[PDB]
């Protein structure tokens, strides 16, 4: 009737991307489980997958705020270039502050939609470093 | 086999929100059509709905960049508060620069998902003025 970390992890495990080992599930058992996806073909990029009532959040880390030469100019450029990355947008997090790439989809989206979002966010993260490299230090 | 402005406008027209007059379709005929949704219950807030290959874009205007007291501080706050608005994120556009609220969903999403995104984005726009008012001039 709606996704939870456990049910979503099971569904994802049965897809080709995971059955083939190109990605793997890391479900953290606890009070309420936390789902992580490791994109093996993106250098083991970990992706956080969390249902949250009004949306399913899919998030990955970009680079620390310290790696940005001009945070002021980069912030404005981020808001001007939403078009650059389909289905996901860049954010700022706290622990040192880090730039993230998050996607959001309906709490009742299909498995294919959730899968597509994860795959797209991973590709977007690599694309961010490729299209924003000029703003980085080294 | 995938949404276009015309087919999406037809589907939306048959939903309760539009059959009741609480929202209405404004499809601009031309070379390739452009779809707009007027949220009558949000002060006739116009919403742009456009399919674009890798995503369906849903966008509305927030306020001109001139209405923001400290664009530098507001930009950083926007990136820190993604959680504030589910399913949509804030951006910057050009004609004078204006702050926008855009949502993105799969090119094959269900009508209910597209409808939910539009409704949520409208509510988010009102919420943005309510939660960010301190950053505005008057």
Numbering used by the authors:
A (entry chain A), B (entry chain A): 37 to 131, 135 to 177
According to the publication:
The domain search performed with Interpro database1 revealed that BacA is identified as a DUF 2170-containing domain protein (Pfam PF09938) belonging to the YjfI family. Nevertheless, the functional dimer conventionally described for the T3SS chaperone family does not correspond to this « asymmetric unit dimer » but is reconstituted by symmetry related molecules, issuing with two dimers each one being formed by crystallographic second order axis. The Tb-Xo4 molecule is localized at the interface of the two monomers present in the asymmetric unit, participating in the stabilization of the crystal packing, trapped by the N-terminus and Trp-39 of monomer A, by Glu-112 of monomer B interacting with the atom of terbium, and by Arg-136 of a symmetry-related monomer B. The 3D structures of the two monomers are very similar, with a two-layers alpha + beta mixed domain, and adopt the α-β-β-β-α-β-β-α topology characteristic of the T3SS chaperone family, with an average root-mean-square deviation (RMSD) of 0.6 Å on Cα for the 115 closest residues over the 139 amino-acids that have been crystallized. Only 8 residues for each monomer, 3 at the N-terminus, 2 at the C-terminus and 3 in the loop 130–136 have not been constructed due to the absence of electron density (see dotted lines Figure 5B). Two residues present alternative positions, Glu-90 in monomer A (A-Glu-90) and His-155 in monomer B (B-His-155), these residues being localized at the biological dimer interface, in close proximity. One molecule of glycerol has been trapped in monomer A in the concave surface of the twisted six-stranded anti-parallel β-sheet in a pocket formed by the side chains of 4 residues (Tyr-72, Phe-84, Glu-95, Leu97).
The role of BacA in rhamnolipid secretion, biofilm formation and virulence, was confirmed by phenotypic experiments with a bacA mutant. Finally, a first crystallographic structure of BacA was obtained revealing a structure homologous to chaperones or/and regulatory proteins.
